[PDB]
A paper describes a structure:
By hydrolyzing SAH to adenosine (Ado) and L-homocysteine (Hcy), the enzyme SAHase (SAH hydrolase) serves as an important regulator of SAM-dependent methylation through the control of the SAM:SAH ratio, and is an indicator of the biological methylation activity of the cell. SAHases are usually active as homotetramers. The protomer has a three-domain fold, with two prominent domains, the substrate- and cofactor-binding domains, separated by a deep crevice. A small C-terminal dimerization domain locks two subunits into a homodimer by quaternary complementation of the cofactor binding site, where a tightly but non-covalently bound nicotinamide adenine dinucleotide (NAD+) is found in its oxidized form.
Numbering used by the authors:
A (entry chain C), B (entry chain A), C (entry chain C), D (entry chain A): 10 to 469
The structure:
């Protein structure tokens, strides 16, 4: 077996030990293996996967394979692979093209190695994506392959936005499931995963004390909620920025001061608009938005000396790292940790005090500087992925006549009953005991004893 | 002026001082007063109101009046009135029939005094309700009045469930707005209000140390989330019960142990099914469900001696207080605080150690033993109420032709843009500064710079 | 029986019900009753007591009486009495002179009624004091009575400071025990009691939401630690001031921003030295120092409109309330809650926005606006009081010859073994289980299996 | 230069970059460098140092050298060295013998290389120790060297206990300073350091989600306080064991349930005495005691399958790892992470579910699996070390006449004024501003405006 490319195949046994531990931390996903292994619901599925090649993703891949699938895999970020996980998957005879510290050229080459087998398009019929890069390449470069693909299952709110833009423009070629919008994904992974992993990554990269220091979290959606908690629970003094007044209300009620980098919140592009007094007191800035240029050049210029700058949104463009590359000298401390010297670009002084510390070159910091979300949290997201793969594969969209395809071409979420079933396995993993409604109580609130327990409008 | 009934009109000046302070804590609601006072959008409205006669409700009532309405008011709970608030409203020449410590007969009489003026139905044309009791009485006993009513604005998730049952059965006679499902209601009031007011009520009633003691919170919806936090932040060791596995998942991730009162969660009605070991260690039980008999007779029998029992859901039927009335002796400590002696019903021993402490006779504890939610939280709920009253009044359902009425007979929520506008005023009240999107950023995420900022599916 | 003065003797039965509950919350104190009742170690003791006449103090008084003492009692603060507690004690035939809302003249008259019985000095032979006022009156006005007194047991760090000044000057006439410096007093009561009771008092007085608002806590000793936690756990954004860099270090590490009201910390008496920007953002100031004028006139002038001002240190002079009385108009909201109108002193405008809310007229806010510390915390302080009374009474200093008195005239703390025994009863009250050392383990760390477990230098 | 032994000298540049960052996080220690560099107070000092060879210790070493000292260094634990720190120190021409993953034989050899230079005793005249191993070797094996040594500065509460045993027995040969008992050491490092670094180490070793899982912390001294917080802030459900009722009282008040591994707390050595129900629910056990066999063989047998076991006390003997070595098979996952298979000793099944995960082979977990305490915390401990070295070096005990030596042979602490001065530099590092007392306020509380601010009895 040679149809793979990883950093170091001798890391496989270490990865396999970590996969075995992870399986014990992932009861929803393992439960699906056990439930469906007889049936082989993914027999004949040929899945192109593009998602962070971590130990958690290894358990996902091996679940899909245990259910009958074949796969070809790549990472969706240049710094997120755990090389022992990639090695263990390759050593199992699964095609994977992923290593920590890819260049952009290598990143694109890895996705292409999944798409092509022996120099020609693979017989793919399903896509599992995280962020939409693989989806975009297939639509732009490999439309013939999409003719034979039954569906896309997309992990991220960023990627879903990209799918919805395509649907609106009539350019989406295959149906999709929005995995993000399961409650056991968005209100588990996006929030509690970042709670676990943000402070982890900052400690691993810097070993800085966080207690007593000042942080600014840009955004207060699910990731910004989790991130703010990650830092506050360590004793940081956390301030929060938002454009959405409802999320800002939540931040206030949650005990944070809501501030803007700009005077009166007005971002008009001048240095004069920056709240220099505010930014000059910040020790750590974290972007969480999924938006562009939310930690901009003028903000970077105004930050307190020796501040840490990082991004936990999907794509690096949240921070103006291009400005920093053009203007300032980068001193690498160790992989994924750079001092950015604001003195200029013509070399640097190792003892200069006027620098910022950038983590993961602005790429997702939890995966870049640590190991991303823990297995017991990714259990929820990845159980949803498996259920979504099963649903779209069984629907067989590619084999439908044109008129029937037109009725099915949509971006949908999984039903609440399945979200509940995933949650129950997670709860049992903690040793939790859910109460069963009596028939009188189920009648009283208007639900089945089996669920679903909430209307689709419920926000949790 | 004599068209009122309150405990003590001499409390009015104290109430008025507290209304003036509350106005300073309610910027959304005060902002609506300022914005709409010229236009008089509620000129000609005649509103029957049934909601807890607190200081916060006084600010609501006076906003409605300032916008042009006439009202006739009662409380929706026998213990929730603040007598100084009722007095201040009556002293202002507004019909109010409410006092703390009503009997059930008096409660019904008060609602009837709003409905009848001078012994005949008042020419009401709007309803503001909290829990659905007024709505039910109008449908059952005064259906002719509904022929002239343009709509109902309902505060509570309980009352909305009741309205949806009526709609489904074809018995709802006028359209309604579900105020609860604004984010600035459900994810503000239900959660943060109970966070503020649950520990407040327990301290006022008992003066018990909470730190280091064991609590069981039944339910983990919005009220159970806020309640659990109210107790955990004081240092309680909190366990959480749930029937909904998604809510139970949240509780686990939030750092609580998820337990059932019943062995393996099976509530089969025998004493043998009670987890006596668990209940024998609990110092405080709080019900949050909106369901029936979630703290049942067998649970009450198994609780640790001297445990506190209370309910923060809308109706008292969450706890089997009828069982306690039939079997055990009640020693009143002070109003809304009773020791329930498990020794029997034939008198009590003042020094008996085998008792429970019941707060507010099992009625909503925050309002019964304290003052309910604080003004700055109720600002959100009550701004929504005013917007909802304006919308339904302006739509004039009662005046529509039959075919037009058929198209508008619905239970609806307010638009997200208005939810956002309420939130923004709340945030400004904390001194928060919301950032404005640049045109490029608004394009990038697919929103208007003015909002709304999220799709209707977003859960916050 | 007529040898008492209370607000309303008909409150006795309510007080007695609350005493019975409190006994169930005070296992250390009740354990001393049970242990020593046979022996009657306080038979012949005649105790002048001056400490907050709360339910908790009632349990203390009745323990002393159960052990053989007779007492005459007063409160040590004009606003701290719970009138039902005072009534219950009077109804039991115990001389008590205390009510909530005394004037200064009445306060002094009440202490004098304890000292004098039937117009002549009582046959006192012990003193229990909280803050040193009774101790001072005896030394200045009744030195003949001190000849027959065996000792003073003093609750407070303020009062201990006053005792140590007297000892140093050679004016202390009888020995004392510093009850404060038991760990089960200072590191229980001073910290966790204020954690429980500060937010309680502010809610009762104002009903303000605390979450999301800005607080300044002046001091970070035991009370400032507890107070800061009381507010932070509610979601306040808390800043801390200190003069002691070690306590300030603790505040930083605990996750607070450490600030001064004065520019660069320099308090030189001018308006120019005030950090107006800082004070203009503060919603709540709490003094915790035991020092003088730590919330001074210039600070008061600079506070944000509608800020709440309160003091939880023993004496009101922490806040310059005299300045406010001389310059600004006081609008009483309700007892212990005043709006202080910064517009001037010539009447007030009920709708003026430029006011501060002062709680308890600057007197200890927890006792003034709520009920002070909870029974389960006061159990520790008051068990120490009883042990201290027993020790000094048994030593019989007054009966010693002059040369022997000279050897015993000291201010001392209780031995660690007794502090440990109190703590063990508290722990058992929570259902806690302490592990017993094996003989090998006790040898390994150099302690007895029975304790004491730490050297006297240990700080906990 | 060849007088060193490290893992990899090519790591030096990386170490030096991390030292430069650490200097920016250590203002107290850097401030001492600046203050004393002119004076060279350690000119002629020849310091044998034995303390964890981390980046933080590198800043300490280079401060000592900057003040005039020569040193010879080793680590005090086999797993605590950061190889890049050791390399940087060796590359600077400083003798260091330390690497991560020493054997016990290598550990002893490294200490011997500090003691011997060119095969003969070095002319050492000062000792800096952490845990007492170097001190013991000098007293037992090299007593002639102690004739020329002016003093020992000891980091740890374990090592101080060892010094006090020697003093009591008349076997201590040179005076010592107890560095641990500075408040800026014990109530900074022991508490907040473990708060930072315990959860860090567990995440690095296992990548386990902690939220929602059950932990047992054995001990509630400074390390157990910080450790419990490290876990609770992540959402663990933490129970605490203690032998000291005062520490157990604190745990209850801090919101933890206090439990014993043994039924009724009685550790009589039989399996029957183990509370199997309790231990069978524990996911993580952490020992913090400084005692022996506090996680014993019978406890290990009863723990829930797949529990994590670790120790953060100074020595590994807290956990019965010898029992595990004799009876159970060890599967290495990666360095400092072993699965201990309870199935037996004859090989292991890679898929066995009945194992425990042991971190750092039971040695101090924060240093073994992460990087120990962060620089900004170690600044306090290490500033104290430098002050202590200066004091004892300047006192010149070895040169004193016999009668003079007898008066100075003691174990002492640094003065409070110096503790305060360290704290002040720490506070300024956070941007904190300490208030200066006015003359009137200093008089009122009986202190100098310059401090010290508290009596020596104050516990903070
Ligand atoms: N690193 C991880 O493991 C991880 C985990 C989950 C999600 N994500 C990624 O994080 C991003 C955010 O995801 P989410 O679920 O929080 O989305 P979300 O929509 O819940 O929240 C994003 C928030 O950013 C706010 N925002 C937008 N522009 C802003 C600006 N200029 N200033 C301040 N606030 C602004 C929005 O109002 C919104 O509330 C996405 O790219 C998502 O894919 C990363
Ligand atoms: N006292 C107050 O001020 C206040 C504030 C807001 C809402 N409320 C009332 O509180 C109630 C709950 O409101 P909410 O917004 O939390 O509703 P919700 O639907 O968000 O939550 C109720 C929860 O109870 C759970 N539940 C139902 N039966 C259960 C059982 N037998 N055991 C355990 N859990 C069970 C459900 O699964 C659900 O998650 C309603 O009656 C509402 O009107 C009171
Ligand atoms: N209300 C209550 O129930 C209650 C409970 C316990 C103690 N107390 C009282 O509270 C007071 C404080 O007691 P404590 O045990 O915290 O004493 P403490 O000595 O532990 O702490 C007082 C703190 O105030 C600081 N301080 C002094 N002057 C200051 C200034 N100008 N600015 C800022 N900080 C300053 C000191 O450095 C010290 O750390 C005493 O009067 C005590 O009797 C009240
Ligand atoms: N890993 C680190 O970085 C680090 C940091 C500081 C201290 N330490 C070490 O940690 C240890 C503890 O230090 P500390 O400052 O907390 O000491 P401490 O004396 O403050 O606390 C130890 C606690 O253990 C308790 N204890 C003793 N035997 C027990 C038993 N059988 N069961 C339960 N509790 C028991 C004691 O009562 C005491 O309260 C020492 O070995 C110290 O050197 C390690
Ligand atoms: N202070 C207060 N005034 C009026 N309504 C309140 C209140 N506190 C809680 N409520 C409302 O009471 C509802 C339940 O009947 C939930 C909440 O909207
Ligand atoms: Cl996402
Ligand atoms: Cl509701
Ligand atoms: Cl005190
Ligand atoms: Cl130590
Ligand atoms: K991970
Ligand atoms: K209220
Ligand atoms: K009390
Ligand atoms: K470190």
């Amino acid at each position: 077996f040679t149809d793979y490319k990883v950093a170091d195949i001798t890391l496989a046994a270490w990865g396999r030990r970590e996969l075995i531990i992870a399986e014990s931390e992932m009861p929803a996903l393992m439960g699906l293996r056990r439930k469906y292994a007889g049936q082989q619901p993914l027999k004949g599925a040929k899945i192109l996967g593009c998602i962070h090649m971590t130990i958690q993703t290894g358990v996902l891949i091996e679940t899909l394979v245990a259910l009958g699938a074949e796969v070809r895999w790549s990472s969706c970020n240049i710094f997120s692979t755990q090389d022992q996980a990639a090695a263990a998957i390759a050593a199992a005879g699964i095609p994977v093209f992923a290593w920590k510290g890819e260049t952009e050229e290598e990143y694109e080459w890895c996705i292409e190695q999944t798409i092509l087998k022996d120099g020609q398009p693979w017989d793919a019929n399903m896509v599992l994506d995280d962020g939409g890069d693989l989806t975009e390449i297939l639509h732009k470069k490999y439309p013939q392959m999409l003719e034979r693909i039954h569906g896309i299952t997309e992990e991220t709110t960023t990627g879903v936005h990209r799918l919805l833009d395509m649907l609106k423009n009539g350019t989406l070629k295959v149906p999709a499931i929005n995995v993000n919008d399961s409650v056991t994904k968005s209100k588990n992974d996006n929030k509690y995963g970042c709670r676990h992993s943000l402070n982890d990554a900052i400690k691993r990269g810097t070993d800085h004390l966080l207690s007593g220091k000042q942080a600014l979290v840009i955004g207060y959606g699910d990731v910004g909620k989790g991130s703010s908690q990650s830092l506050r629970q360590e004793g940081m003094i956390v301030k929060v920025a938002e454009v959405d007044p409802i999320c800002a209300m939540q931040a206030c009620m949650d005990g944070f001061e809501v501030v803007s980098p700009y005077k009166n919140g007005i971002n008009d592009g001048t240095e004069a608009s920056i709240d220099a007094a505010l930014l000059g007191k910040i020790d750590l800035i974290v972007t969480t938005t999924g938006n562009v240029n939310v930690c901009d050049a003028n903000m970077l210029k105004a930050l307190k000396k020796r501040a840490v700058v990082c991004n936990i949104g999907h794509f690096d463009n949240e921070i103006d790292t291009a400005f920093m590359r053009k203007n300032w000298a980068w001193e690498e401390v160790k992989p994924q940790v750079h001092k950015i010297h604001r003195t200029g670009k013509d070399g640097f002084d190792a003892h200069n005090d006027d620098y910022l510390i950038l983590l993961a070159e602005g790429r997702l910091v939890n995966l870049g500087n640590a190991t991303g979300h823990p297995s017991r949290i990714m259990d929820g997201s990845f159980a949803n992925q498996v259920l979504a793969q099963i649903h779209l594969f069984e629907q067989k969209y590619a084999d439908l006549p044109a008129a029937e395809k037109a009725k099915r071409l949509s971006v949908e979420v999984l039903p609440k009953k399945l979200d509940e079933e995933v949650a129950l396995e997670m709860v049992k993993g903690f040793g939790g005991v859910v109460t069963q409604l009596t028939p009188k109580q189920a009648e009283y609130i208007g639900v089945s004893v089996e669920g679903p327990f909430k209307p689709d409008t419920y926000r949790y």
